[PDB]
Write an enzyme that holds these catalytic residues in place. Structure first.
Site, mmCIF file in Angstrom:
data_model
loop_
_atom_site.group_PDB
_atom_site.id
_atom_site.type_symbol
_atom_site.label_atom_id
_atom_site.label_comp_id
_atom_site.label_asym_id
_atom_site.label_seq_id
_atom_site.Cartn_x
_atom_site.Cartn_y
_atom_site.Cartn_z
ATOM 1 C CG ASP A 85 -1.643 1.143 1.590
ATOM 2 O OD1 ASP A 85 -2.027 2.238 0.249
ATOM 3 O OD2 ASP A 85 -2.543 0.649 2.401
ATOM 4 C CB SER A 117 -2.048 14.153 -13.326
ATOM 5 O OG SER A 117 -2.712 14.356 -14.846
#
Length: 330
Positions: free
Chosen positions: A35, A199
């Site tokens: 994770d 992004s």
């Protein structure tokens, strides 16, 4: 040193991925959920409330000659999905894919919430975010990667998750046969303890690319892709019959649909998520309403590039003094 381990979907939807991990002496092998959005290595154990164990493999520290109680240390964690666990702490030898760390904090669960009990395929979590998020008190502990870093050939790990197929987590090296083209690296902020990046924009299907900054986290422990409501609405508007359902808890679409792809920007490069990766199947057994793999982050407080996005790429988690992320197509 290096390590290399295969990671396998837990079910036919890729809801999560499990990776075998050796703990203790003699080894006890547990299947953990790696994770990159958390920083605790915790396991079902001989100490877990018996009614809360249902099929998982447990770690029994009394059977390990290298286990030592970390005196006074406790832990307690709550995840973004509302699940939680807590317990005490041992140090022990932990190996992943041939890479061994001695003295790793192994957090032994005394209590787990219902969603963990109900998932017999996940024996615990192995956190790979930054150690500043580790919950051990009063002395915070380091992640497996942090402990291994100095010994690795290169201070990196990579995630190569499969679509309906096994993949690989590598530690200490970048497998240049595992991706196409070049790797594009992008800056990381560690201020929230996550692999947080920005992004450069998105496209829906064959549509034109929209240049827009989207700050979010690379999180292998989250199944879906969570993005701003504007972006998600633009995606689902291209699917006939798709709608946001408050009763289901997100966007649903007719199971008869063919979904468009979704592209996200990494610098000047582009990662394409095929439409099929966005189908999470019937909302309930036998239903013709299917659950979408792209969902709004509006209620979370952070955008999450979860498995839907990461499994379309070869992803480099670069833990150099100034950390960065790398993405390549594959």
């Amino acid at each position: 040193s290096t390590g290399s381990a295969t990671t396998t979907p837990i079910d036919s939807l890729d809801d999560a991925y499990i990776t075998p991990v050796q703990i203790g002496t003699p080894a006890q092998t547990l299947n953990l959920d790696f994770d990159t959005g958390s920083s605790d290595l915790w396991v079902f154990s001989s100490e877990t409330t018996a009614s809360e164990v249902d099929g998982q493999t447990i770690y029994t520290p009394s059977k390990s000659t290298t286990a030592k109680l970390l005196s006074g240390a406790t832990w307690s964690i709550s995840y973004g999905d509302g699940s939680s666990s807590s317990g005490d702490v041992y140090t022990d030898t932990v190996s992943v894919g041939g890479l061994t760390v001695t003295g790793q904090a192994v957090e032994s669960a005394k209590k787990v919430s219902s969603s963990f009990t109900e998932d017999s395929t996940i024996d615990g979590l192995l956190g790979l975010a930054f150690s500043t998020l580790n919950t051990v008190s009063p002395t915070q502990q380091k992640t497996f990667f942090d402990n291994a870093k100095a010994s690795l050939d290169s201070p990196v790990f990579t995630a190569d998750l499969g679509y309906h197929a096994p993949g690989t987590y590598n530690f200490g090296f970048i497998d240049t046969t595992a991706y196409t083209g070049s790797i594009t690296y992008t800056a990381v902020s560690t201020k929230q303890g996550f692999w947080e990046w920005t992004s450069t924009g998105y496209a829906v299907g064959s549509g034109t690319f929209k240049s827009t900054s989207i700050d979010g986290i690379a999180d292998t422990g989250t199944t879906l892709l969570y993005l701003p409501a504007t972006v998600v609405s633009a995606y689902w508007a291209q699917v006939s019959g798709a709608k946001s359902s408050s009763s289901v808890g997100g966007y649903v679409f007719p199971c008869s649909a063919t979904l468009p792809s979704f592209t996200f920007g990494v610098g000047s490069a582009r990662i394409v998520i095929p439409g099929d990766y966005i189908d999470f199947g019937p909302i309930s057994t036998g239903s013709s309403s299917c659950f979408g793999g792209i969902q709004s982050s509006a209620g979370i407080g952070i955008n999450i590039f979860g498995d839907v996005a990461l499994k379309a790429a070869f992803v480099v988690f670069n833990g150099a003094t100034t950390p960065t992320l790398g993405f390549a197509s594959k």
